[PDB]
Amino acid sequence: LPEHVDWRAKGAVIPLKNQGKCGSCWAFSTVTTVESINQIRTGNLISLSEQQLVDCSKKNHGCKGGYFDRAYQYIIANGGIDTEANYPYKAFQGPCRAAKKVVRIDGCKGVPQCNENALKNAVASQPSVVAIDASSKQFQHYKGGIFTGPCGTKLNHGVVIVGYGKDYWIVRNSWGRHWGEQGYTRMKRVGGCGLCGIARLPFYPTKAX
Numbered sequence: 001l002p003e004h005v006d007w008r009a010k011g012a013v014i015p016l017k018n019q020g021k022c023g024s025c026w027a028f029s030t031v032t033t034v035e036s037i038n039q040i041r042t043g044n045l046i047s048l049s050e051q052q053l054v055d056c057s058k059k060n061h062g063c064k065g066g067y068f069d070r071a072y073q074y075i076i077a078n079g080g081i082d083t084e085a086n087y088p089y090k091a092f093q094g095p096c097r098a099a100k101k102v103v104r105i106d107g108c109k110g111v112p113q114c115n116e117n118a119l120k121n122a123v124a125s126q127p128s129v130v131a132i133d134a135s136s137k138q139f140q141h142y143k144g145g146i147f148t149g150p151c152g153t154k155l156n157h158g159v160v161i162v163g164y165g166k167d168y169w170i171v172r173n174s175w176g177r178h179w180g181e182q183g184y185t186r187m188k189r190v191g192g193c194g195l196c197g198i199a200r201l202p203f204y205p206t207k208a209x
């Protein structure tokens with residue numbers, strides 16, 4: 001595949017976000033993926049609402065927990081998601097409004113587990129959301145350079161792989177521009193089930209046209 005690919009320079013990836021003192025990693029991640037797939041086939045780059053998710057994906061748990069195989073189905077079975085402007089962020093759950101369906105997808109497809117060689121495939125076609133063990137000190141206290149550091153698998157956080165390189169990943173978090181490398185964190189590539197288990201639960205939204 002292309003040795004090195006970045007969806008941030010292609011104009012597919014929106015600026016960094018900030019989930020806030022709220023356990024909504026599961027929403028931010030799974031949502032920024034549906035943002036870049038819609039900015040690839042359609043050609044439009046919109047910032048959808050992570051709040052319509054905390055307020056409507058009842059299946060999940062707003063600010064305290066969430067999974068990918070349930071944030072996606074929500075967005076499809078409902079006709080779509082609403083933008084951020086319309087449905088701004090509040091940093092906490094609440095009722096579920098009369099929002100519109102500005103975007104949507106046909107489904108979602110999972111990538112072969114603990115297989116990074118082919119995860120580089122999906123991430124080479126479009127941003128793929130993943131889960132990791134983002135509770136370690138070095139992880140939580142990463143700033144620059146390529147993060148090798150300590151962390152045992154057993155995922156707890158969700159993010160978006162927006163690119164990669166000869167030996168590292170370009171992970172997209174959701175803790176503001178003041179964390180890691182301007183909101184992002186480059187995680188080394190290859191290892192088995194991945195660094196902080198990166199290749200354990202891969203996933204990305206699909207689309208027609």
Ligand SMILES: CC(C)C[C@H](NC(=O)[C@@H](O)CC(=O)O)C(=O)NCCCCNC(N)=[NH2+]
Nearest residue numbers: 022023024025026065066131155156157158
């Ligand atoms: C794979 C990714 C999506 C991890 C996921 N984490 C979350 O949804 C959030 O808590 C993420 C966050 O940092 O806000 C997760 O596994 N959450 C578990 C749900 C609650 C389990 N915890 C309990 N019940 N002690």
